[model samples]
Target chain A: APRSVDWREKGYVTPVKNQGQCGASYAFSATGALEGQMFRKTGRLISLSEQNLVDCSGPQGNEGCNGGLMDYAFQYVQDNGGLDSEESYPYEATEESCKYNPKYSVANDVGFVDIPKQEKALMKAVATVGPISVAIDAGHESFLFYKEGIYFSSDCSSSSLNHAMLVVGYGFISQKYWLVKNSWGEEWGMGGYVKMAKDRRNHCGIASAASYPTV
Target chain B: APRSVDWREKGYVTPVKNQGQCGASYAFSATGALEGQMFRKTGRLISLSEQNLVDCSGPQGNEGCNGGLMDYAFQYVQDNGGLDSEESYPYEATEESCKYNPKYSVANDVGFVDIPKQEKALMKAVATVGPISVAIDAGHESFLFYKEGIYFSSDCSSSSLNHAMLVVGYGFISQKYWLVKNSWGEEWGMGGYVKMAKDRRNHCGIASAASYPTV
Candidate 1:
């Protein structure tokens, strides 16, 4: 049975973070999905470190404070054993030398499941799993300063996925929409979040390249 | 013939003012409409006294700062002969005994025109008659902090018109929208304004009670 779900309300989603001017949205997405997975499994909300992935995941083909992928970041966590807590590996919002430390490891990912190229499949993954990492075309000004309402743009193409974000949940109020937690701090959007139109022909390519880590 | 025109660009509209915590939107609406009419006739922008209507229009069925109606406020000005300038009358934001002075009177409206019960009529009134006074349901929290975008809520209905505003202009972007000037200071919405959805069955009852003053 398909139903509405909200990970943020369930106390599984972490607080919003800011990536500053860096292009490290992928690291924030990975951290969010991992935090959700850890909370769902252990019944404990843990603030994982995105700086750990940002500074240490270079060997896994991720540029620090630069562009990266969620799947690759998850793979790096799995290969490097685990990730550190935010207390020990606080974010710097800039490219820095590697500071890999296993002593501060507090969370780890078992693996990630890549949902099929369908909206239903993504919905099921979000309902059963925790948050899902997804990329979108956020080049429009309407999206950059989106204050409220279900954002749907015909100009947002799935072929151009430039910004990465975490789909923490979904709902069916007036229309089907996904609750996305952004890393642009709590001052942007609806407290550093946005509700994207869910099932309007895969608006903004939210269903394309959706994956989530399991603890 | 063009489909849209901005009264602010035409130098017929006044600066956006704040109503504070009081429900004095009706006073601001009446003042805005009259200011537009005065400017259109005299080719000079003049700020009218909302406070004069706030404290003095209670005899005409207005409750001062608590709550009021645009039509009644307009009727009060017509009956009282004229309104004072902002520098002379001034706004207090709270209800006080009427301190109106005829010596400070700078603007006056001879009569007001009530637009027909149609969107086209409202559009024509705004395009030709300067800023139009209208009421809407501003009960939604989204409407309070609305930053940008053509606001359209399924929850908002035309049956309830509690908040009064000035329809400064209209435009057709990706979708048709009405540029509404509000009295909530310059920090709310698009600089103390909102781009409400236009031509969508008179969304928010924008055309239901529209009227403009004549100089």
Candidate 2:
């Protein structure tokens, strides 16, 4: 793993998006992971459609905009050929009936790789394998208002993973931190980003439920 | 195989669609055949997208709005999952870039069977298999002005087929005729339909280039 690296700086990330009232954080996380892999495989940054997942992944075990898992979302993409471009299948906060655009698929995830529940493994994966999808307990009061700083909360729990996010990088800024990307738009956190404590022990379950899409 | 059967009357065929100035009759023929099969398989009459084939079947040996073959279009549907719904991928007439919606696919064609180059075989296929795609040399001047009648012309050739159409049914109305569906608008030719001579001599090459989508 690099001593200091940010995948966002290398153009492996898409613009921050808002999930609104819908609990579609998992879909956002899945798109980010696949977007990173697509960049690595094709040397192009194609923004994938998260709305495609929220609408059409129901048969693949996804709960539409209610809630779901990144693994199941990737599975849907694998079976459904690929994800449509965000331009073709724009996001709708209110989950609508499926309107998938497979021929306009900007990218596809052949499968995925689940990282071991260890900060070392996650750090290495993010460093070499591009962005990774991670689940975390974002219920802490400090998490919602987190700004520019190494965020660490004692109240964050590994067992209470509630929201999914993308881990784009890992580094030390006076203290070890993981460069995490959020789905609550650019107004929240540091331009829709948060540096969470990455001092091992799977803080907030970030490493426990970490995975990334593969080519 | 009734004395006379019209699939259109049974709600198995979509409305006659104009191909505009684009030479995409094969796309219309392909979609019409699949639309018929989808009705048989799902009991739902969905108007499949013809533009999807015209734009995306290039890799499957098609020439976009220039021209193509129904067998190649069906092959594209087999590999590309399925054709998009007309509502999602509406026709544009122009040869634009491809846009697909596999998730919005209302139907899929597993494969296709080419009919024997004989009117008897084509008639039986159209009577049993919802609809069959057929190509014909529609260059005769009498074909354009054909309004409503048992259309038969000695100038029509079994070879040099230039246009694709759908064979919906067969019947005997004073004379043996094959009920054919045209890609032209409803204003032309008996509401975009024609009953051509099916006296088993393969007139207009209808049977020489005939096939239909399977389940």
Candidate 3:
């Protein structure tokens, strides 16, 4: 049985931050995962700002907060000199002025992985890659207030409210396999998280993953 | 008085008429909204395949079925040639194999756009462009099952587990600005559609429009 995820254990000493006005959640998850892994490995907590990537990353499209590839974010960070310290830049709750050391907030050079033309390949990417970012079909606008548990639905495929999430670890939650961790407040389910039905892995193409090379 | 929206108005039709399976909903929303727009524009219903977009789009991090950005899908369709007819690529509850045609599907043109920076641009784009894709911090999962009229949420900033919606057309629904459309099945609200609170004018950043420009 998995215990509740402590934000602090993840070294996210700060409360779960918001994406603000930017849908650079891909970056947030990318940064969050990096932060989690780095802290897990080095014991140093870094507040990488999501804005740094939001301002400098590539163009996103109509699919809504639907833009930014995690692999690209990793590259943006690596080349642009990595994301900004969240404290220095701070989450503005909306995309705003960089107002920080440009050097500290520079973009980095990242490469892309030739994801197999297969959906399963996408899932493999997620499993092998560090935490991957994804758009989930949480089902309905009410899911926006999810406090916990894996979601199941009949028509989750048709609604249009999209959300971003970080695939940290996969495991059985409430008798189901779930790719979890979302950026919402703890007031939501699973402390701002969700456990999706694993069988639906290929549903949203979340099976896709972005990553930095193990240089 | 509000103008009635005919599903046939967009000349859009579903492939094989399958119900909900994957959260490939972003695909459905994009196709459905486009179908409505097409029917409204051309006066002929066209059947587009959500499966084609789901299967062929390259390395989409979001799951193909559950949820995704409409902007990305549009660009994906444009770059990779127009979307395949539903007859060409039938819908499946599962992800499909990659045809891998360079004829369509651009690898990495999509960059990230922050909601704050791109929302207005997108909404403005939609007024002049087609349906604008967007992701909302819907605030709760319960909203996912919503299928009715004039959804009102006092707190709209927090990231809810459930999300997604296409800004097909913005107008007064019951005297309030509302976005119109269909849901998976009518079991949802009204024929699987709902009218959200319409104060879109003051809505800023991601709230207004988190869409992308396609090729």
Candidate 4:
């Protein structure tokens, strides 16, 4: 039986961080997934630098401050060396010069895996592979002031994905929901987290483009 | 026995309006409730002007761009004779001098009634008396881009209310939810509306300070 597991309560999840109008949710999503992978393998929780990918991943076709892709961010980190801690390469909340310091690299990934567009497969990936990076149509009004409850958006579609998020865990609570971590800050939605509706035809494209890091 | 009714589908609710970046949800809540009352009484769906309350209702301690109170707005309408139509007093999305014109008045209110701080009282008010004006803690990040679902926030409280909205109807679909109309725009949540959780110990303070205009 697939039981419920909350990575947040398990301490596998790191503290929520803010992207702050920078459209750098993709970086945060990648960092969160990698952080989870590092924690599961080495039993060490590290706060990875999203700013490093924000500044240095531009050569990988990522338009920093505007938008980028999680796959591209992962590739950039793997090709350029690895990722650093937030303390070594702190967030600037804006596009800035690349301060890629290999000396501060805390974790490295050989590659990434794209989860199949199947709910059960996605569920298994999240259960065994740690947190996964995904995207959704977060441009809805209900999402703007979302505080709690199982979020099910009939107004949402995977055709137009605009925001990135990390799926930390999954479980059945009254109804099944995906435990998602956002990058908007802790003051926003459920301490910068949301329980999105699961098993509803990939509601909000949560299963559309899910991927995880391979440590 | 319990029931469910959506004022929007019943043709009592007017088209969703946008308040832009202004903190003028109070005016929209007032207009929505008034429009509902007018439609129910005269069998006419009239689009009222939020600008009238925004520009003229400040003397009652209601800030135009910053914030305002719905009760004060209703009192202003009662004292000022009536409110204008949208065509006569269109929204400017900015603070302006009071442009009170009796010629543009389309609807008048003798007074307003504040509903009790109880869920059943609120339900009865919406079912029989038309839409009700209420305030909520809309400062959360999930609310900034909410798309759909029955929102229930434990992080919210009635200790200090911020944004105002209209409760057009109530129902139990999979779970109990309050059909709320927001001031973002038609492109927002469920056509600029949200289905908030009901009966969860005043979740988001939906029944904290509820009132409706009496036509």
Clashes of each: 0, 3, 97, 18
What C-alpha lDDT, on a 0 to 100 scale, does residue B15 get in candidate 1?
83
TM-scores of the models, in the order given: 0.50, 0.50, 0.44, 0.50
Residue pairs clashing in model 1 are none
Looking at model 2, give its docking quality level: incorrect
Off by over 4 Å in 2: A1-215
Per-residue lDDT of model 3, residues A1-215, tens digit only: 23222334455333466675566666666666566555545567666777665665542211124344455556555555556677667665555444547666422233334342233544554455545455555546656665556665544532233555676655555454454676666666776666665555344334432232321
Model 1: lDDT of residue B101: 91
Candidate ordering by lDDT (highest first): 2, 1, 4, 3
**Each model's lDDT:** 0.83, 0.83, 0.51, 0.82
- Native A-B contact fraction in model 4: 0.00
CAPRI accuracy category, model 3: incorrect
lDDT of 3 by residue, B10-93 (tens): 434332233365766566656655554555455665666677777766333334654555555665665565666665566776
Give me the displacement of residue A56 in model 3, in angstroms. 2.9
Report the TM-score measured on chain A for model 1.
Answer: 0.96
Off by over 4 Å in 4: B1-215
Give fnat of each prediction, in order: 0.00, 0.00, 0.06, 0.00
